[model samples]
Target: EVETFAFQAEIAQLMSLIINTFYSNKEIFLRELISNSSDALDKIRYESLTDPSKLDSGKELHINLIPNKQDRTLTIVDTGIGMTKADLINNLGTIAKSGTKAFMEALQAGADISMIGQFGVGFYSAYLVAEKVTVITKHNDDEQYAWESSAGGSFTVRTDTGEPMGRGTKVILHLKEDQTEYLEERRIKEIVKKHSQFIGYPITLFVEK
Candidate 1:
């Protein structure tokens, strides 16, 4: 039901590069995550265009920001296109071989990066504010799966045996001690508006007491 995998040498390097290069602007992690969520939604929308069967789930497409102060976790949930096991492995840590190189090139160029998904390694930005990240996702074509990592040298992926969450992804970030500010209601609102304002889907935020 569960399996642990070592990150590709390429991704381990990408993780270090993202954390080190963007360490100064830690808050930008929100933007990257939101952007990635938006990307997934876009895919579902696009896929449904040709074959409406993809929309059979009937779940409204959107994102949910859940910040649990007690648990010290900030979770980003999206009712978007979910990932399969292959998607989790390739997308999470051991991304496309070419993807790693392209991301590095962009970083070296200092190309005024706007949408973090453009580089394809934006998911790692979660490391800036989190000690651990867990992604529970379900795809219409596959069963639910969970992908988790601490942005360290390895990550884990497994079949989700718990309650079935409808199609999409739930990215849970276990906040870092000094980075707990990300769980603030006020700050979460500010970052969402600033970065994801133009996104098409609704992004609801709930701060648990």
Candidate 2:
């Protein structure tokens, strides 16, 4: 019930490097994800301000992190703007105008600049630990799609059979054995507060051991 896409060799290598090296600190994962959630909220809020109908019937704009150590899965859900098929392929797959090369070139040139974003590859952070990730998302314009990726080079996108998510997105992170520290409440909180407190969204992290 799902369609899939395969990444070219070049993109695979790039993803491997970023997921493994660019994300030097594990704590950074939470911050980046939360910041992304904030963006979604801001997007939806802006739309709702002009077109109330754009807002889901009763959905609230917030983020919820549910950690399941029993299943070794940590889920971060956000009731905000979701993604469509085109949005996923463009926003999640390739960076803006294929900017990864230029971004790296800037780094090599000793550019003391921060360019962690705008590339739209932040979602690849899930590869840092999880061997597989399932993204269940519902968009305002299209049917819900569940994207499952085992690693770089290939990912499956299909019509989700699960319950309706109403209007939002859910990211499930399957933490590896050594990366279980992310399941701790203190650790999750510290990361969110340090980097994403001012993101203008309510983020609740549920710690599960």
Candidate 3:
């Protein structure tokens, strides 16, 4: 069964502001996304060190980026620690930190909203350039599931029947009309070098053969 959840009071207001007003430089999104992926990989790798069985055979830790110009979509897949349904609900729905009220007050007082990162607002940055964002993830101990949202304050989660991801997460972004630059291989590479060149895991950008 599909379940829906609303963004936290703080998240709803912050996302609306971030999507509509902040994020003057949209390319930083790639950095934030890749950073999150790297963190997930780190978590799984750390766990595997203690319990080798936690590591999935043949599932090397890597990040793949595929951009489709015709469809204006960008897909980012990472062989990393995925999330359970409860994890999704808690991670995406809540503010994550205690400074929500203060953060909002600071925004209204003209403090730079970009500083919202201190409160774990990075995920909402996706909506700055994507009209819709879908996340399909499979945890080692949980069933594969999909979470979708428009950054309009609500999201839906349900069981996913698509091809298994083994143990990882996949993010599909429906790019906005004016955000087409993100689909360019050159631009993506530039952003990667500028933002994620030092990342631990190998990040592969898909190219046509």
| Per-model TM-score versus the true fold | 0.90, 0.87, 0.90
lDDT of each: 0.82, 0.73, 0.82
lDDT of 2 at 53: 89
TM-score between model 3 and native: 0.90
The alpha-carbon lDDT assigned to residue 112 of candidate 1 equals 37
Model 2 per-residue lDDT at 147: 84
TM-score of 1: 0.90
The reply for model 2, stretches above 4 Å from the true place, is 8-10, 19-23, 94-97, 110-115
How many steric clashes between backbone atoms does each model show? Answer: 0, 2, 0
Q: What C-alpha lDDT, on a 0 to 100 scale, does residue 93 get in candidate 1?
A: 44
* Residue-wise C-alpha lDDT for candidate 3, range 51-109, written one tens digit per residue: 89888533499999999988888888998898888889895454454566666777778
- Runs in model 3 deviating more than 4 A are 95-116
Ranking by TM-score: 3, 1, 2
Ranking by lDDT: 3, 1, 2
RMSD value for candidate 1: 2.2
